[PDB]
Amino acid sequence: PAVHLSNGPGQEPIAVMTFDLTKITKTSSSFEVRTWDPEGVIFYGDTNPKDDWFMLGLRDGRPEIQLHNHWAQLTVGAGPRLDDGRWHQVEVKMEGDSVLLEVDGEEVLRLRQVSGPKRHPIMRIALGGLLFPASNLRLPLVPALDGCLRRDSWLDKQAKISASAPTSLRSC
């Protein structure tokens, strides 16, 4: 059961979820993605769109992470091209103070010393788009990602406060 990561011309995400950070024990997300599109946003996360946000996307077909928080501000590409039309497994995990990115079962990137142990305790996760204008990225891209998403798990179901309407979704 797959859903489109893009719905029409607009750049708005296809879904948003909110979580209570005081109740998250599983700090990882995993999904499968398929696309012929070399550029776009896969998902976005934040507790504050000005001071504490994260983006996983594609640029030139390869994963790109942009991160801006108290401890780190970076724009990093890594891993192989994923715009080949094959399904790819992706996992993003927080391990200690590091963010790990695994692609097709292989760790391709570890951003060390990017997270601390004060913080707004509501985390939003947006799929297929950002929760601010693309102009506010560290390095702008065009967020629309013409691809499909399946087998997707986001953080801890036990900590979810809200989830956007699922009837917005468009089957693949």
Ligand X SMILES: COc1cc(C[C@H]2COC[C@@H]2Cc2ccc(O)c(OC)c2)ccc1O
Q: Which residue is nearest to ligand X (CB)?
A: 54
Among residues 123, 125, 144, 149, the one that binds Ca ion under rule CB under 5 A: 144
CB of 116 to Ca ion, least distance (A): 29
Q: Report the candidate in 114, 80, 78 with the shortest Cα–Cα distance to residue 94.
A: 114
16 is a contact residue toward ligand X (CB under 6 A): no
CB of 146 to Ca ion, least distance (A): 6
24 binds, among Ca ion, ligand X, a second copy, none (CB under 5 to 8 A by kind): ligand X
Cα gap 131→113, rounded to integer Å: 25
Name the β-bridge partners of 160: 19
CB of 126 to Ca ion, least distance (A): 16
128 is a contact residue toward ligand X (CB under 6 A): no
37 binds, among Ca ion, ligand X, a second copy, none (CB under 5 to 8 A by kind): Ca ion
Q: How many CB atoms lie within 10 A of CB 100?
A: 17
Among residues 67, 103, 137, 141, the one that binds ligand X under rule CB under 6 A: 67
Which C-beta is closer to ligand X: that of 86 or that of 112? 112
Residues 22-51 interacting with ligand X (rule: CB under 6 A): 24, 27, 29, 45-46
Contact residues for 120 (Cβ-Cβ < 8 A; gap 6+): 47, 48, 52
Q: How many CB atoms lie within 10 A of CB 118?
A: 6
Which residue reads 């292989």 in tokens?
106
Contact residues for 116 (Cβ-Cβ < 8 A; gap 6+): 70, 71, 97
- The one-letter amino acid at 166: P
The residue ranges that bind ligand X (CB under 6 A) are 21, 24, 27, 29, 45-46, 52, 54, 67, 69, 92, 94, 99, 114-115, 155
